[PDB]
Each structure stands twice: as structure tokens, then as C-alpha cells.
Design a protein around this ligand. Sequence first.
Ligand SMILES: *[C@@H]1O[C@H](CO)[C@@H](O[C@@H]2O[C@H](CO)[C@@H](O)[C@H](O)[C@H]2NC(C)=O)[C@H](O)[C@H]1NC(C)=O
Ligand SMILES: *[C@@H]1O[C@H](CO)[C@@H](O[C@@H]2O[C@H](CO)[C@@H](O)[C@H](O)[C@H]2NC(C)=O)[C@H](O)[C@H]1NC(C)=O
Ligand SMILES: *[C@@H]1O[C@H](CO)[C@@H](O[C@@H]2O[C@H](CO)[C@@H](O)[C@H](O)[C@H]2NC(C)=O)[C@H](O)[C@H]1NC(C)=O
Ligand SMILES: *[C@@H]1O[C@H](CO)[C@@H](O[C@@H]2O[C@H](CO)[C@@H](O)[C@H](O)[C@H]2NC(C)=O)[C@H](O)[C@H]1NC(C)=O
Ligand SMILES: *[C@@H]1O[C@H](CO)[C@@H](O[C@@H]2O[C@H](CO)[C@@H](O)[C@H](O)[C@H]2NC(C)=O)[C@H](O)[C@H]1NC(C)=O
Ligand SMILES: *[C@@H]1O[C@H](CO)[C@@H](O)[C@H](O)[C@H]1NC(C)=O
Lengths: 98, 595
Amino acid sequence: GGNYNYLYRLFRKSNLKPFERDISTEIYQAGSTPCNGVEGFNCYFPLQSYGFQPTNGVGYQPYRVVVLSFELLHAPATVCGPKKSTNLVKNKCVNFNF
Amino acid sequence: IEEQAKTFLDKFNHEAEDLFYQSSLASWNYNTNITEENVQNMNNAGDKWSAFLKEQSTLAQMYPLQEIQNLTVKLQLQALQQNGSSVLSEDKSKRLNTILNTMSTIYSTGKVCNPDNPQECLLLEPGLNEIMANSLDYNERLWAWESWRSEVGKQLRPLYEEYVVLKNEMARANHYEDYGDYWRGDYEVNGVDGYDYSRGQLIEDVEHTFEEIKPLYEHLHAYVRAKLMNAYPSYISPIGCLPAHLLGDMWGRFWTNLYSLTVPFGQKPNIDVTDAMVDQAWDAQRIFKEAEKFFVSVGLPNMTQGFWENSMLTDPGNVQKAVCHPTAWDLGKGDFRILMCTKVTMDDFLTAHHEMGHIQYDMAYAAQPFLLRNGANEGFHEAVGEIMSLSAATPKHLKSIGLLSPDFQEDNETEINFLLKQALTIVGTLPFTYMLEKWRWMVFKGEIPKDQWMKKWWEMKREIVGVVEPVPHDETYCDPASLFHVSNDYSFIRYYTRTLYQFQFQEALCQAAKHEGPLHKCDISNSTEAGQKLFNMLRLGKSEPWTLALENVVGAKNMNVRPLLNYFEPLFTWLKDQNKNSFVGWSTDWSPYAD
Ligand SMILES: *[C@@H]1O[C@H](CO)[C@@H](O[C@@H]2O[C@H](CO)[C@@H](O)[C@H](O)[C@H]2NC(C)=O)[C@H](O)[C@H]1NC(C)=O
Ligand SMILES: *[C@@H]1O[C@H](CO)[C@@H](O[C@@H]2O[C@H](CO)[C@@H](O)[C@H](O)[C@H]2NC(C)=O)[C@H](O)[C@H]1NC(C)=O
Ligand SMILES: *[C@@H]1O[C@H](CO)[C@@H](O[C@@H]2O[C@H](CO)[C@@H](O)[C@H](O)[C@H]2NC(C)=O)[C@H](O)[C@H]1NC(C)=O
Ligand SMILES: *[C@@H]1O[C@H](CO)[C@@H](O[C@@H]2O[C@H](CO)[C@@H](O)[C@H](O)[C@H]2NC(C)=O)[C@H](O)[C@H]1NC(C)=O
Ligand SMILES: *[C@@H]1O[C@H](CO)[C@@H](O[C@@H]2O[C@H](CO)[C@@H](O)[C@H](O)[C@H]2NC(C)=O)[C@H](O)[C@H]1NC(C)=O
Ligand SMILES: *[C@@H]1O[C@H](CO)[C@@H](O)[C@H](O)[C@H]1NC(C)=O
């Protein structure tokens, strides 16, 4: 029946900066004539919706997308991956890291 | 301005797709499971599409069209701006729709009952179809011929005549001359500096090409006229034309019905690998496995894996009311579907490819914009599919898949048979397809007055096609009107050119695939370079004018019949031995009644 609860913005005057976020819903005007806040010719609401039905081909099915990006600003001690640790031994000349 | 339109189409090409997606979905679920509520469920959903289309069709008259520079977005608007109707008076608008379905139903209610028994009253498809197909009686088939058009086309003559009238005034209001000018409009390409194409020039192209094959059509007509005196003595003169009621069907479009009485060597067993399939337990999955296995061997991608479950391959085991006709569904969003009822023969092995080729053709231009997702013209969609069925008719293909014995020896006695099966299909329709569309336009452009519409129709059947009437017809039968695409308002030139485009695709690949024998023995399988040149054309769709698209494979800018006459040369070598005593030619004065 169409899961129309996922939307996307197709209109802007200018392209974004990197990492920029625009949750505004201001009614877009493409043409010269103003609109007095309603829609009309060359005068469009700048959000549209994803049509999703489960019998759609790949490339048209929703994907759950996770974007990372690391940062190193000025922080002393932060997080990081996991550091494994081998088994400790005793009574033998060994090369160790604690 | 130009920059206001290029944003408007980004509104149209998202809000139309998800309303197109459901409107084809209801016509899918109804056609696989017929109920009453699903008739209603597709009426409003299809009405959501028609009202939305006439909603934005009027918006393209806000923008003037010739101030745009990008030809891509210029092509989208000129299709969308097309009104079609809506330019006339509205009591006159319903007047054609009062004509139109009334023209549609009279063709579908044509009942025929005998003078000896008016109680058994046959329709066209039950019985009446089988009379002209297999029954071999002369006095029978003349009764079925005359009583069909005198009882169906007699009645559409006061329907079609006024329907020509109101079709042209709408057409001239879109600045044309007739409705014949409108149908040429899919071939018209203007202003791209060397690939340009005007509407009137296709009349010149069809009049040049058709005169070149007229030796061959005179030679099949000579050969079959040497054969019909056996099955029909004392009825056809060997100099004159053929009567119009024994031609294979009611109008004789296809001549496939006449292979049996006109076989070259009746004692020679034609290949029909049907018993071979059942001795290896060939189910429905085994057929479409090889059909996909052939297309990966040529250099084209797999099936989309949502093709298999979502399609209906067979008829269902339940008593399921569903229309059974092999079609390829192209609903969108990466969903492509097939629908047929497979019975495991070699015949359904042949049409297993012609429908799969439509999928891979619609799998090709999936990256196009929405208004350009067709073939490059209307003849290209059935042309790309049927050349894939030609590759399965080669016996080297079947023995390579493990279906023929390896010691199968291709004698030339079955080659004279096998090419004669094709020649009663391929060459059998082209003097039919041209002779109608030549007639329909002079009626459309008004070169014939209405008291002469039948008078000039039954002339050109005799000279071009070599067929004489059984019965003299006055102005009251509408003998052209009785045909399906005639009575259902369909453009009939798309069937002539579709044949010519096939072989231009065919031999150019068989030149690329390094074949050395005759044209009917080349094989496209196992090659890559025959797939690469073809894939170059398939990804275009309508983003390019077709005149550039045709030279992408062959290298020319118009239809060339020289590939077609390359095919029949083993046949035509054999056939010229068969007219050493017969008379290649028809006299158009003799009739079966004027004696
Ligand atoms: C053909 O389609 C109709 C409706 O599309 C089916 O009828 C009902 O469909 C709903 C689907 O939401 C089911 O929940 C009901 O159980 C169906 N009714 C019955 C009596 O089963 C119908 O079933 C379909 N035909 C077949 C053979 O399944
Ligand atoms: C106007 O035509 C140009 C090409 O003549 C199109 O330009 C392409 O645009 C796409 C994305 O918009 C790019 O990925 C291509 O690299 C561009 N090609 C070239 C050669 O520049 C342009 O898209 C057309 N305008 C519209 C609105 O479709
Ligand atoms: C579609 O039909 C209209 C007729 O209603 C054609 O003409 C337009 O007519 C209205 C008023 O009747 C004018 O305001 C428009 O300016 C007219 N259009 C133009 C382009 O001048 C219209 O031309 C038709 N469109 C096509 C593509 O044939
Ligand atoms: C199939 O090929 C054979 C071999 O060439 C043909 O047989 C010859 O036909 C010519 C033509 O009349 C005769 O003069 C020869 O005497 C034939 N030779 C033999 C060994 O039979 C045969 O005609 C071909 N069949 C067809 C239908 O083309
Ligand atoms: C054409 O493609 C077929 C399919 O791969 C090839 O057929 C192989 O033929 C050899 C010898 O007859 C068999 O041993 C193989 O098992 C066949 N392949 C398969 C997958 O069964 C054939 O070789 C190809 N043509 C050429 C010239 O390579
Ligand atoms: C098609 O599917 C087969 C499954 O046997 C797979 O091996 C093959 O790689 C696929 N084709 C392509 C071009 O990836």
C-alpha cells in the first residue's frame, strides 16, 4: 500500500556546505512571480515523499544507511577501536607490553 | 523562460511515477485473478492516472516551446504538451466516444448463423476462426467470408464515415492536414543537423523499398499459384489472381496456415523437439533457464531475481479465472514481470524468448527519464524481440544444448522446407501491411470521396497483392473496417517497418559474430561482440533520435531491405527452378464470378 513515511528535499536555491542541515520547510519559488505563501506555477513545496512497496526492484527498495566520519579537534583522551591482549606468561624471558 | 521549465519537470517526474506504479499494479492483479471487485479496483486507480495526466497536460501550454535549447528537456515537453483531444466542443467530444466504443463492440458482437440453421450462431473466434484455418471446402469458406463483413462492416460504414470527419478537425487544430499526418508524428525528428527526419519522407521510403522485393512476392505468388490447383481445382485461373476466401485466414494477413498443402518435401521430418523434452522431464523452470542461459552467453545481464517469484509462468492449478496471453509487464521501480501459460513444446520454447527479449529491452533503458522509456520508435519494440526467436530456430543451437542427437545431418531438403515456413510469415504480410496503410491515408487526407472508398479499395487489392474478390461489392460493406486494428483505431505502419529493422540487426551481428555460411545458419550465441554492439543501442530508449540509434548497430540512417533479401537466397536459388513453366504475374481482370 505504500510506506510514504520517508521524505526527501528536491529543491534549493543553493547547494549546501559540507555537513549542512536544513530542516526548514519554506515554500520554494522557481519563477519571477511571487505567490503570497501559497503554491502555484513555478512555486513548489520543497519536500517530496518516497513511494515504497515491497515488490519493487533493487535500487528502489529502502536501504538503511549509516555514515561515519572521525574527528580529531583538540581533545586529550577520546575513544577508539578495541585493543586485544594475548595470554600472559611467567618465569620466562619475554617481550612484554602492558 | 528556459529555467522555469527545467525545474517543473523535476516536479512531474516524481509525482507521476508512484501514481503510475499503482495504476499498472491493479491491471496486473486483476489479470492474474479475475473478480468483480478488482474490475472496480482498477477502474478508479486507472482514473487516478487519467485525471492526473489531463491535470498537468494543460500546464505545458504555459511555456512557449521554441525558447528551449537542451534537446533532452525539449523532447519531454513536446510529448507532454500534446493535447490530443480537449480542443473541440464537448457535446462533440462525447459524440466520438459515442462512436468509439460503439465501433468497438460491433466488431466484438459479430455473430454468424447459417441459412439452413439460424439457431447455431457462431462468433468470430469460436468456429468461424477454425473454418478458415483448417476446413478445406470452397463453398463453405465463401459463405463465411461474405457473411462476416456484410454483417459487421456493413454496420460500421455509417459509424466510420462520420468518424473520419471529426478525427481530422481535431488533427488540423493541432496544425496538421489530416489524421494521416498525426501517425507519422512518431517518426518525425526535426533540427539536429544531419539526423533530421520529416513526416512526408516515409511515404517515399516505403514506396522505394516495397518495389524492390516485388520480384520475390511475385515469385511466392507464382509458386503457390502453381500449388493451389491441386488443393483447389477448377476455381482459380493460373494467370489471374486468387480468390479472397481461401487465404489462410479471413483476410489472409498471415500465410502460415498454408504450409501443409504447400510443403516442399512432405516426407521430410521437420524438427519438432517436443518428444525430446518430455523424455528428459522438461518442466516450466527448465525452459526459462535456457532462455536466460542464452542471454548471458551473448553478453547481457541476468534476470533481476525478482522476476522469478513475481511472474506467473504457467496457468495456476486452481480453477483460476485469468486472461492467458504471453505479455511482458514493465510496471516500474525495477519490477518487471511476465505472464503466460506454458505448455512444454518447441513452439512455446520459441515464444519463451520473444517475451524475454522484451524484458531485457525494458531492463535496458531503466536509467532514462520517465517520458522517454520506450523503444526509439513504435516498430522497434517488437523488432528487438523477434530476432531473438530466430536464433533458436537454428539446429546447431539445439544440438549444442543437448536436445538433438550429435549425428544430426543438416541436409538441404529440410532447409528448403524451413525457409519456406518463414517465407509464408515474413514475406506473406508485407504486401498486406502496405496495401492497407496506403489505402487508409488517402481516405484520411481525403483523396477519395466517400462514394468511392470501397471503389478504390478493391482496386489496389488486385494489383499490388494479387487477390480477387469472391463477390462484387457495392458501396455498403466497409470491407476495410472488418479488421481488428482497423476497427480498434490502431496505427498499422508499425508492422511493416518492424520486419525491415529485424534483419538489419540480424546480419550486422552475424557479420560481427564471424559467420561464413548462409544467413539462416548464423548463431549469435557464445559471442560477446555481438552483444556489445547491440547493448550500445538498447540503453538509449528515446533519449536519442532513432536515426542516430539505427546506425549505432548497422551504420545507416534509414531502413534497408538489402539485409532482408540476403536471407532468402538459398531459397530463391531453389525457387527459380520452380517457375520455369509457370507464369510469374497476375492479370487483374479475371474474377471467379465473371465467367
Ligand atoms: C482474488 O482477489 C480477491 C481480492 O483481491 C481475493 O479475495 C479476498 O482477498 C483478500 C485479500 O486482502 C483475502 O484476505 C480474502 O481471504 C479473499 N477472499 C477469500 C474468500 O479468500 C481472492 O481470494 C483472490 N482469488 C484467489 C483464488 O485467491
Ligand atoms: C542539458 O544537456 C546536458 C548535456 O548536453 C546535460 O548535462 C549532463 O548533466 C548530467 C547531470 O545533470 C551530468 O552527469 C553530465 O555529465 C552532463 N553532461 C554534459 C555533457 O555536460 C544536462 O543534464 C541537460 N539538462 C537537463 C536539465 O537535463
Ligand atoms: C492545446 O489546446 C489549446 C486550445 O485550448 C491550444 O491553444 C491555446 O489556447 C489558449 C486559449 O484557448 C491560449 O491561451 C493559449 O495561448 C493557446 N496555446 C498557445 C501555445 O498559444 C494549444 O496550442 C494546444 N496545444 C498544443 C500543443 O496543440
Ligand atoms: C542438395 O545438395 C545436393 C548436392 O549438391 C544436390 O544434388 C545435386 O543437384 C543437382 C541439381 O539438379 C544435380 O545436377 C546433381 O546431380 C545432384 N547431385 C547429387 C549427388 O544428387 C541437391 O539438388 C540439393 N537439394 C536441394 C533441394 O537444393
Ligand atoms: C558455446 O557455449 C557452450 C555452452 O558453454 C559450450 O558448450 C560446451 O561444449 C563442450 C564440448 O561440446 C562441453 O564439454 C561443455 O560441457 C559445454 N559447456 C557446458 C556449459 O555444458 C561451447 O563450447 C561454446 N562454443 C565454443 C566454440 O566454445
Ligand atoms: C547470473 O547468475 C549466476 C548463478 O548461477 C551467477 O553465477 C552469474 O555470475 C550471474 N551473472 C553475472 C553476469 O553475474
